[PDB]
Design a protein around this motif. Structure first.
Motif, PDB file in Angstrom:
ATOM      1  N   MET A  59       0.895  -1.205   0.035  1.00  0.00           N
ATOM      2  CA  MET A  59       0.075  -0.018  -0.069  1.00  0.00           C
ATOM      3  C   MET A  59       0.851   1.232   0.012  1.00  0.00           C
ATOM      4  O   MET A  59       1.979   1.285   0.502  1.00  0.00           O
ATOM      5  CB  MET A  59      -1.123  -0.138   1.125  1.00  0.00           C
ATOM      6  CG  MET A  59      -1.680  -1.330   1.130  1.00  0.00           C
ATOM      7  SD  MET A  59      -3.273  -1.251   2.188  1.00  0.00           S
ATOM      8  CE  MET A  59      -4.458  -0.091   1.476  1.00  0.00           C
ATOM      9  N   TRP A  60       0.448   2.247  -0.786  1.00  0.00           N
ATOM     10  CA  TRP A  60       1.374   3.327  -0.944  1.00  0.00           C
ATOM     11  C   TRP A  60       0.540   4.743  -0.958  1.00  0.00           C
ATOM     12  O   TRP A  60      -0.279   5.039  -1.719  1.00  0.00           O
ATOM     13  CB  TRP A  60       2.042   3.488  -2.199  1.00  0.00           C
ATOM     14  CG  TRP A  60       2.866   4.232  -2.981  1.00  0.00           C
ATOM     15  CD1 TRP A  60       2.861   5.663  -2.603  1.00  0.00           C
ATOM     16  CD2 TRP A  60       4.201   3.836  -3.315  1.00  0.00           C
ATOM     17  NE1 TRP A  60       4.193   6.220  -3.320  1.00  0.00           N
ATOM     18  CE2 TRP A  60       5.155   5.255  -3.529  1.00  0.00           C
ATOM     19  CE3 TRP A  60       4.806   2.766  -3.812  1.00  0.00           C
ATOM     20  CZ2 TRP A  60       6.393   5.213  -4.329  1.00  0.00           C
ATOM     21  CZ3 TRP A  60       6.129   2.909  -4.613  1.00  0.00           C
ATOM     22  CH2 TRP A  60       6.896   4.207  -4.621  1.00  0.00           C
TER      23      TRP A  60
ATOM     24  N   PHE B   2       4.893   8.857  -7.200  1.00  0.00           N
ATOM     25  CA  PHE B   2       4.897   7.382  -7.691  1.00  0.00           C
ATOM     26  C   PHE B   2       4.723   7.239  -8.926  1.00  0.00           C
ATOM     27  O   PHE B   2       3.977   7.985  -9.591  1.00  0.00           O
ATOM     28  CB  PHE B   2       3.351   6.865  -6.977  1.00  0.00           C
ATOM     29  CG  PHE B   2       3.468   5.296  -7.413  1.00  0.00           C
ATOM     30  CD1 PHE B   2       4.293   4.415  -7.135  1.00  0.00           C
ATOM     31  CD2 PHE B   2       2.286   5.096  -8.223  1.00  0.00           C
ATOM     32  CE1 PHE B   2       3.904   3.121  -7.476  1.00  0.00           C
ATOM     33  CE2 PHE B   2       1.836   3.840  -8.432  1.00  0.00           C
ATOM     34  CZ  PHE B   2       2.880   2.671  -8.122  1.00  0.00           C
TER      35      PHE B   2
ATOM     36  N   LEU C   7       2.301  -4.441 -10.575  1.00  0.00           N
ATOM     37  CA  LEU C   7       1.499  -3.304 -10.416  1.00  0.00           C
ATOM     38  C   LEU C   7       0.237  -3.550  -9.704  1.00  0.00           C
ATOM     39  O   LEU C   7      -0.200  -2.801  -8.944  1.00  0.00           O
ATOM     40  CB  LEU C   7       1.268  -2.694 -11.780  1.00  0.00           C
ATOM     41  CG  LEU C   7       2.626  -1.789 -12.307  1.00  0.00           C
ATOM     42  CD1 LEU C   7       2.310  -1.163 -13.779  1.00  0.00           C
ATOM     43  CD2 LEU C   7       2.607  -0.501 -11.648  1.00  0.00           C
ATOM     44  N   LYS C   8      -0.367  -4.662 -10.100  1.00  0.00           N
ATOM     45  CA  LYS C   8      -1.610  -5.031  -9.308  1.00  0.00           C
ATOM     46  C   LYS C   8      -1.537  -5.056  -8.081  1.00  0.00           C
ATOM     47  O   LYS C   8      -2.542  -4.904  -7.286  1.00  0.00           O
ATOM     48  CB  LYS C   8      -2.000  -6.516 -10.042  1.00  0.00           C
ATOM     49  CG  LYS C   8      -3.432  -6.927  -9.592  1.00  0.00           C
ATOM     50  CD  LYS C   8      -3.502  -8.266  -9.926  1.00  0.00           C
ATOM     51  CE  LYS C   8      -5.162  -8.881  -9.803  1.00  0.00           C
ATOM     52  NZ  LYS C   8      -6.079  -7.846 -10.676  1.00  0.00           N
TER      53      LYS C   8
ATOM     54  N   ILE D 117       0.109  -3.244  -6.023  1.00  0.00           N
ATOM     55  CA  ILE D 117       0.218  -1.990  -5.375  1.00  0.00           C
ATOM     56  C   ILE D 117      -1.176  -1.506  -5.361  1.00  0.00           C
ATOM     57  O   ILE D 117      -1.360  -1.050  -6.175  1.00  0.00           O
ATOM     58  CB  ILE D 117       1.131  -1.205  -5.799  1.00  0.00           C
ATOM     59  CG1 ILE D 117       2.588  -1.981  -6.048  1.00  0.00           C
ATOM     60  CG2 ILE D 117       1.474   0.166  -5.174  1.00  0.00           C
ATOM     61  CD1 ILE D 117       3.801  -1.355  -6.971  1.00  0.00           C
ATOM     62  N   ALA D 118      -1.416  -0.948  -4.103  1.00  0.00           N
ATOM     63  CA  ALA D 118      -2.670  -0.223  -3.881  1.00  0.00           C
ATOM     64  C   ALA D 118      -2.178   1.171  -3.437  1.00  0.00           C
ATOM     65  O   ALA D 118      -1.386   1.337  -2.820  1.00  0.00           O
ATOM     66  CB  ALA D 118      -3.751  -0.866  -2.707  1.00  0.00           C
ATOM     67  N   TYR D 119      -2.701   1.997  -4.344  1.00  0.00           N
ATOM     68  CA  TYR D 119      -2.237   3.410  -4.159  1.00  0.00           C
ATOM     69  C   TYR D 119      -2.995   4.703  -4.171  1.00  0.00           C
ATOM     70  O   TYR D 119      -4.500   4.169  -4.469  1.00  0.00           O
ATOM     71  CB  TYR D 119      -1.517   3.725  -5.828  1.00  0.00           C
ATOM     72  CG  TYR D 119      -0.884   4.951  -6.044  1.00  0.00           C
ATOM     73  CD1 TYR D 119       0.067   5.548  -5.475  1.00  0.00           C
ATOM     74  CD2 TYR D 119      -1.793   5.968  -6.849  1.00  0.00           C
ATOM     75  CE1 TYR D 119       0.610   6.868  -5.634  1.00  0.00           C
ATOM     76  CE2 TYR D 119      -1.175   7.290  -7.245  1.00  0.00           C
ATOM     77  CZ  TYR D 119       0.068   7.775  -6.624  1.00  0.00           C
ATOM     78  OH  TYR D 119       0.481   8.969  -6.667  1.00  0.00           O
TER      79      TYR D 119
ATOM     80  N   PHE E 237      -7.690   3.873  -1.946  1.00  0.00           N
ATOM     81  CA  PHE E 237      -6.906   3.266  -2.506  1.00  0.00           C
ATOM     82  C   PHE E 237      -7.505   2.307  -4.040  1.00  0.00           C
ATOM     83  O   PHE E 237      -8.516   2.031  -4.034  1.00  0.00           O
ATOM     84  CB  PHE E 237      -6.247   1.802  -1.715  1.00  0.00           C
ATOM     85  CG  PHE E 237      -5.447   2.608  -0.555  1.00  0.00           C
ATOM     86  CD1 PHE E 237      -4.051   2.792  -0.803  1.00  0.00           C
ATOM     87  CD2 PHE E 237      -5.985   2.893   0.620  1.00  0.00           C
ATOM     88  CE1 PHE E 237      -3.264   3.536   0.187  1.00  0.00           C
ATOM     89  CE2 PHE E 237      -5.325   3.575   1.608  1.00  0.00           C
ATOM     90  CZ  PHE E 237      -3.954   3.827   1.457  1.00  0.00           C
ATOM     91  N   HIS E 238      -6.411   2.459  -5.010  1.00  0.00           N
ATOM     92  CA  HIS E 238      -6.927   1.989  -6.107  1.00  0.00           C
ATOM     93  C   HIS E 238      -5.717   1.070  -6.730  1.00  0.00           C
ATOM     94  O   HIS E 238      -4.625   1.212  -6.476  1.00  0.00           O
ATOM     95  CB  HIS E 238      -7.329   2.820  -7.223  1.00  0.00           C
ATOM     96  CG  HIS E 238      -8.562   3.682  -6.947  1.00  0.00           C
ATOM     97  ND1 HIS E 238      -9.689   3.256  -6.968  1.00  0.00           N
ATOM     98  CD2 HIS E 238      -8.468   4.749  -6.654  1.00  0.00           C
ATOM     99  CE1 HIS E 238     -10.467   4.141  -6.721  1.00  0.00           C
ATOM    100  NE2 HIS E 238      -9.809   5.422  -6.444  1.00  0.00           N
ATOM    101  N   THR E 239      -5.806  -0.037  -7.428  1.00  0.00           N
ATOM    102  CA  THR E 239      -4.735  -1.018  -7.799  1.00  0.00           C
ATOM    103  C   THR E 239      -3.855   0.032  -8.567  1.00  0.00           C
ATOM    104  O   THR E 239      -4.499   0.919  -9.487  1.00  0.00           O
ATOM    105  CB  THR E 239      -5.049  -2.139  -8.429  1.00  0.00           C
ATOM    106  OG1 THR E 239      -4.055  -2.869  -9.110  1.00  0.00           O
ATOM    107  CG2 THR E 239      -6.074  -1.904  -9.847  1.00  0.00           C
ATOM    108  N   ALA E 240      -2.584  -0.080  -8.812  1.00  0.00           N
ATOM    109  CA  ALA E 240      -1.804   0.541  -9.947  1.00  0.00           C
ATOM    110  C   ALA E 240      -1.720  -0.422 -11.081  1.00  0.00           C
ATOM    111  O   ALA E 240      -1.265  -0.009 -12.173  1.00  0.00           O
ATOM    112  CB  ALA E 240      -0.266   0.690  -9.230  1.00  0.00           C
TER     113      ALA E 240
END
Lengths: 224, 4
Positions: free
Chosen positions: A62-63, A70, A90-91, A93-95, B1-4
């Motif tokens: 989580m970022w 980013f 990438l999938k 990583i929750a941003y 939060f959302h997936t990258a």
């Protein structure tokens, strides 16, 4: 519960860190603009996804971003050059972008929902990045009276981060652009030498290595 | 939060 250790990609920096950054801890990297703090964050966001015999924790990320720094393309580059599928990396990583320091604080509570969701799956959250930890606090709490207020709010935010680290066995990794108190577990001073070379030193950690690690910024993130 |  036993802590885990995420390799940074540099053997030198890993040795300085006793194997890697730790779960159940907040590691703060601090240094001037351009010292590589965000490069280390990007690198860790890929390394943590590796299996443990390759220095990862099979983990999700989580970022929380406060500076729009980013770069999914950088994640893709690091992943591909380490044998990984960039889209899958990438999938996991929750941003989220934090609008201001109060939203940044709330995003820590928001993050706990996904942490709980993923906890007993095969890719639990193992890394939580806050980049920058301090930029919004610097801009918002300024002038006479602000030192005490800012330090109080930042300490509360760090307490919330420590709780997530410790309760859910997560490495929290935070950046700070630099006589104030700090409450991170471990503080790492980064600086830039020449070209893509960077030097790291542990601060106020007399029981751990007193030398300096040196690494380069490369297409694999960081490397010796 | 959302997936990258």
């Amino acid at each position: 519960a036993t802590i885990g250790r995420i390799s940074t990609g540099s053997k030198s920096l890993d040795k300085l860190l006793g194997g890697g950054i730790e779960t159940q801890a907040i590691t703060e990297v601090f240094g001037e603009f351009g010292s590589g703090k965000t490069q280390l964050a990007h690198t860790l966001a890929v390394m943590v996804q590796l299996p443990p015999e390759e220095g990862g924790l099979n983990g999700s990320v989580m970022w929380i971003d406060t500076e729009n720094t980013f770069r999914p393309e950088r994640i893709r580059e690091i992943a591909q050059n380490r044998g990984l599928d960039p889209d899958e990396v990438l999938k996991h990583i929750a941003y989220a972008r934090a609008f201001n320091s109060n939203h940044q604080m709330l995003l820590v509570q928001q993050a706990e929902d996904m942490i709980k969701e993923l906890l007993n799956t095969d890719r639990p959250v193992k890394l939580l990045i806050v980049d920058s930890l301090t930029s919004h606090f610097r801009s918002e709490y300024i002038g006479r009276g602000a030192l005490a207020e800012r330090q109080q709010k930042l300490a509360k935010h760090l307490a919330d981060l420590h709780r997530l680290a410790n309760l859910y066995d997560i490495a929290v990794f935070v950046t700070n652009q630099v006589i104030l108190a700090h409450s991170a577990t471990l503080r790492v001073y980064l600086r830039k030498g020449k070209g893509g070379k960077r030097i790291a030193r542990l601060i106020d950690a007399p029981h751990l290595p007193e030398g300096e690690a040196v690494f380069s910024i490369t297409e694999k993130g960081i490397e010796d | 939060f959302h997936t990258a």
